[PDB]
């Protein structure tokens, strides 16, 4: 809605400007219900959260005791995460490029929310390879996927068939659920998808 002077979503400065001016349409202001029920099913799982933004989910996982690393290449995003994490859990977030970052553990679960749809279309192929590289066979890429093409972006919507073309060479779809606490921008568009890394 506002007039931003950064336009390249590949740049951390792009996301800085949105956080800095308080224009963050994607922000849930909390932990989504489906994240909570999925995480309860995988209480021991080591979790990577790329493009974590405010990182509400990392605070929640800290309370459940999962190993977790949340990363965001945006300084303003990491400042937002620190506000949520406080000094107590600040070490769970790092300012890092998802496409460069090596986690200090092998993830059992990489949690997706409003990250794939933050990426320019040209970064989608990298996303798939990176997820496949990070996840061993049987491990999970699971979270909220923003389905259906959009005219502009971000958020860049993705057609179901294009998402298949991206992930099925590496993942089997094993869950596709309606979401019952979605915010306006994602209402009726996001779904919870669980992808299992192929062996
Ligand atoms: N290559 C990259 N590595 C790490 N973070 C990235 C990234 N590309 C985009 N991002 C980050 O992804 C975020 C998209 S906004 C989504 C934030 C959060 N996942 C939420 O659900 O609320 C921004 O904070 C941006 O800085
Ligand atoms: Cl986003």
Residue with tokens 């992808």: 195
Q: Give residue 180 CA to ligand 1 midpoint distance, Å.
A: 23
Experimental method: X-ray
**114 close to 84: Cβ distance less than 8 angstroms:** no
In a domain, 15, yes or no: no
Number of domains the chain contains: 1
Structure tokens at 18: 């949105």
Select from 112, 113, 92 the least CA-distant residue to 103. 92
Tell me how far apart the alpha carbons of residues 78 and 71 are, in angstroms, rounded to a whole number.
Answer: 8
Tell me how far apart the alpha carbons of residues 167 and 124 are, in angstroms, rounded to a whole number.
Answer: 10
Residue with tokens 């070490």: 91
In a domain, 69, yes or no: yes
In a domain, 179, yes or no: yes
**144 close to 31: Cβ distance less than 8 angstroms:** no
Neighbours of 162 (CB within 10 A): 14
Q: Is 113 annotated as a binding residue?
A: yes
Q: Is 98 annotated as a binding residue?
A: yes
Task: Return the residues preceding each gap in the chain, C–N over 2.5 A, or none.
Answer: none
Specify the residue with its C-alpha closest to ligand 1, atom 11. Answer: 51
Q: Which domain range does residue 128 map to? A: 30-197
**92 close to 85: Cβ distance less than 8 angstroms:** yes
- Return the CATH number at 73: 3.40.50.150
Strands 47-50 and 109-113, bridge-based pairing:
parallel
Tell me how far apart the alpha carbons of residues 193 and 131 are, in angstroms, rounded to a whole number.
Answer: 14
- The CA-CA-CA angle for residues 31, 126, 185, to 5°, reads 35
The distance from CA 174 to its chain's CA centroid, rounded to whole angstroms, is 18
For residue 20, give the ligand nearest its CA: 1
13: enclosing H helix or E strand: helix 12-20
Give the sheet arrangement for strand 47-50, strand by strand: 93-95, 68-72, 47-50, 109-113, 140-146, 190-197, 171-177
**131 close to 103: Cβ distance less than 8 angstroms:** no
**97 close to 75: Cβ distance less than 8 angstroms:** no
Q: Is 73 annotated as a binding residue?
A: yes
Q: What is the DSSP string of 39-98?
A: HHHTTT--EEEET-TT-HHHHHHHHHT--EEEEES-HHHHHHHHHHHHHHHGGGEEE--T
In a domain, 50, yes or no: yes
Q: How far is CA 179 from CA 32, 41, 75, 123, 189, in A?
A: 9, 17, 30, 26, 9
Q: Give residue 146 CA to ligand 1 midpoint distance, Å.
A: 14
Structure tokens at 55: 């990182």
């Amino acid at each position: 809605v506002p007039d931003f002077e950064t336009r390249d979503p590949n740049s951390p400065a792009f996301w800085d400007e949105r956080f800095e001016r308080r224009f963050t349409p994607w922000d849930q202001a909390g932990v989504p219900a489906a994240f909570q029920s999925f995480a309860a099913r995988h209480s021991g799982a080591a979790v990577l959260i790329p493009g974590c933004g405010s990182a509400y989910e990392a605070v929640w996982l800290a309370g459940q005791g999962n190993p977790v690393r949340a990363i965001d290449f945006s300084p303003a995003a990491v400042a937002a995460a620190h506000e949520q994490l406080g000094a107590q859990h600040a070490q769970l977030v790092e300012q890092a490029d998802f496409f460069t970052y090596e986690p200090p553990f092998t993830p059992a679960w990489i949690y997706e929310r409003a990250f794939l749809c933050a990426l320019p279309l040209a970064r989608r192929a990298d996303y798939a390879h990176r997820m496949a590289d990070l996840l061993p066979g049987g491990a999970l890429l699971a979270g909220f996927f923003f389905l259906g093409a959009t005219p502009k972006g971000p958020p860049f919507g993705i057609e179901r068939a294009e998402l298949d073309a991206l992930l099925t060479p590496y993942f089997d779809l094993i869950e596709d659920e309606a979401v019952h606490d979605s915010i306006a921008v994602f209402a009726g568009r996001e779904r919870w998808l669980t992808w299992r890394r192929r062996a």
